[PDB]
Each structure stands twice: as C-alpha cells, then as structure tokens.
Structure 1
Amino acid sequence: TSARTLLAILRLSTALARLRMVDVVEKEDVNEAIRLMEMSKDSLLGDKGQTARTQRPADVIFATVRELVSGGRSVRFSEAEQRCVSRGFTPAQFQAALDEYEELNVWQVNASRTRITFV
C-alpha cells in the first residue's frame, strides 16, 4: 500500500454517488466501496481473514480497576464503583468476579470486603 492506492480510494467514491441521480455522497457509498476491496484482497490468498473473541463476563471489569492502581494504592471499595455503573455494569456480577481472581492470588480484601489494594 503506497501512494498509488491512495488515489484509487477517492476514485470509487463517485461510482456509487452517480447511481442515485444525486450530486452528494453519503456513508453508504463509502462502506460499499471498501467492501469490494476487502473481498478482492482475500481472494488472492487461500483462506479468509477473520477474528475470534469470546465475550467474557469479567474481562472489562479488571480493566476498570487498572484506572485506579496507576493513580493510587489504597483504593476505596466504594469509590471504585463510581465508574463501573456509568457504562451499565450490573453490581451483582461484580461480587462473583472478585472471587475469580482473589482465589488465583491477585489482590486481597478484608473481613468486611471494604478495602482493596493491589499487591
């Protein structure tokens, strides 16, 4: 991919805008233009480039705690929930997710489960 393929992308932007008898371009003429490019480059090989990702119900929870470890050590248990409930994380799944990592020796809590500190 160099400067030769840069001008080829702008050339396909007018191939679909002239089919609707209009003089403007929309988002449909852009997504369909790159669709034929991704299909052509995958046909030159012997397989199709895909991806694999499992929606873990506890993958984004550990990433939220990382925002408080780099800022401090004695992170309050009630203060860490000020950002988890913003996107829409249910608090019932957070109680079952702490034992998934505390059992494997990651962090530690107290008897009342109100103090969390990254070891």
Structure 2
Amino acid sequence: LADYITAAYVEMRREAWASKDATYTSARTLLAILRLSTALARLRMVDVVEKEDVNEAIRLMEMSKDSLRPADVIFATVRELVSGGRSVRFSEAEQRCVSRGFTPAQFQAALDEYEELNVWQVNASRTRITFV
C-alpha cells in the first residue's frame, strides 16, 4: 500500500499547493494520515493495515479540510496512425479498428461521419485516406 499512499499524498499536496488558503501540507500531514490508518487498524483489531483504513483516513482528512460514440473512438484510433504521416492506408486502419472491437460497418459509418466534417478525404479506390 506504500505506493498508493504516496500517490494519494502527492495528490493532496498538489491540491494544497494550488490553493493558497489551504494548510501547509508538510510531512506532518503524511504522519497524521499514517497515524489515522494505524488507529483504524487497531480499532478493527487487525495486525495488518488494509486499504480500507487508508481510504477512511483520506475521507476523514478531506472532510476536515472541507469544513474550512463509435465515431469518436474510431477517430482516435485512426489519429493514433498519424505518427508523422498525412496519408493513412485503409487496410491498416480497418484492421486496427476491428481489433478494438468494432464491426466494419461502424468503421465505415465513423469514416463517413468524420468525412462530412471536412477532416479528411478518402480515395475513390478506398485504399488510402489523405488527412486535410
């Protein structure tokens, strides 16, 4: 749980840095949340601190401080293939979209829908697509 605790402490300290009116979240806040987790573990009578105690400590600290479409997915899929190229092969994009769990009919529908928006132009042979 140490990595998760460090991530949560980082998030809380970033939030306290963004807000000028928040209390200075120095090492003492991490010590306090560790003490809260250990106290919760003692309360539940367990020799090992679980993630529920950490979550409850985070919840308590947050309450205390508070008192003061297929078209888009297919567009992203074909955007992933814009690594330095203006034109993209039809077969590669179709295979990558099918591998993501979309039928070719939805691929064609998304292609047409984003073609309406003047984003790109598809060759009449349906072999290459040139991105405007």
CA distance in 2, matches of 1:17, 1:111: 67
CA distance in 1, matches of 2:86, 2:126: 16
Identity of aligned residues (%): 100
Q: Which has the higher helix share?
A: 2
Deviation at 1:88, TM superposition (A): 2.9
- Change in CA separation of 1:82 and 1:29 when aligned onto 2, cut-off 3 Å: farther
- Change in CA separation of 1:72 and 1:36 when aligned onto 2, cut-off 3 Å: same
Q: Select 2:43's aligned residue among 16, 19, 25.
A: 19
TM-score for both structures, normalised by structure 1? 0.68
CA distance in 2, matches of 1:96, 1:78: 16
**3-state SS of paired residue (1:12):** helix
- Change in CA separation of 1:69 and 1:34 when aligned onto 2, cut-off 3 Å: same
- Change in CA separation of 1:9 and 1:93 when aligned onto 2, cut-off 3 Å: farther
Deviation at 1:97, TM superposition (A): 1.4
Deviation at 1:75, TM superposition (A): 1.6
Q: Which runs of 5+ in 2 are unaligned?
A: 1-24
User: In terms of mean alpha carbon deviation, does 78-87 or 21-30 score higher?
Assistant: 78-87
Q: Select 2:128's aligned residue among 90, 109, 115.
A: 115
* Residue correspondences, number: 107
Q: CA RMSD in A?
A: 2.5
Runs of 4+ in 1 over 6 A off after TM superposition: none
- Change in CA separation of 1:27 and 1:64 when aligned onto 2, cut-off 3 Å: same
